[PDB]
A paper describes a structure:
Filoviruses encode a viral protein termed [name] which is important for nucleocapsid assembly, replication and transcription and also plays a critical role in host immunosuppression. The structures and accompanying [name]-binding analysis performed by dot-blot assays and isothermal titration calorimetry reveal that MARV [name] RBD coats the sugar-phosphate backbone along the length of [name] in addition to capping at the terminus, suggesting an alternate mechanism of [name] masking for immunosuppression.
MARV [name] RBD was crystallized in space group C2221 with one molecule of the [name] RBD in the asymmetric unit. Interpretable electron density was observed for residues 208–329 of the RBD. Like the [name] RBDs of EBOV and RESTV, the RBD of MARV [name] contains α-helical and β-sheet subdomains connected by a short loop. The RBD of MARV [name] is 43% and 41% identical in sequence to those of EBOV and RESTV, respectively, and the crystal structures align with a root mean square deviation (r.m.s.d.) of 1.07 Å and 0.92 Å, to EBOV and RESTV respectively. The location and in general, the contents of both the central and first basic patches are conserved among the structures. The residue F228 is located in a hydrophobic pocket that bridges the α-helical subdomain to the β-sheet subdomain.
Residue numbers in the entry: 208 to 329
The structure:
């Protein structure tokens, strides 16, 4: 199971499009894949869904409990400017904190052409 297909599977459970949870799904999928745990992550996700939690909460829950994600720093994503960041993510942009980690709600860091930065908070 590729990071791409894992992310797509997660997408099938998420409301809307291009939301911070879609970004989170992509970020987590890549980390899970590289850790040799794409399967275990998907199974853990499915378990949480089966307990009545929907995907947004399941993903934030996994981001703070699943071992592959603990203490991992968010990826930097390059953009021309912050206008490039999808509309449904704009209101979740923040100044970058001292030590952002995924398990504390910091999904990614957007970096503009000039090295101005914003973190995506969930």
């Amino acid at each position: 199971l590729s990071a791409k297909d894992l992310a797509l599977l997660l997408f099938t459970h998420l409301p809307g499009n291009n939301t911070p949870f879609h970004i989170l799904a992509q970020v987590l999928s890549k980390i899970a894949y590289k850790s040799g745990k794409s399967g275990a992550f998907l199974d853990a996700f499915h378990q949480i869904l089966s307990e009545g939690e929907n995907a947004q909460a399941a993903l934030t829950r996994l981001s703070r409990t699943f071992d592959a994600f603990l203490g991992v720093v968010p990826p930097v994503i390059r953009v021309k400017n912050f206008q490039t960041v999808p509309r449904p993510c704009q209101k979740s942009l923040r100044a970058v904190p001292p030590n952002p980690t995924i398990d504390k709600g910091w999904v990614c860091v957007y970096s503009s052409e000039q090295g101005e930065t914003r973190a995506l908070k969930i």
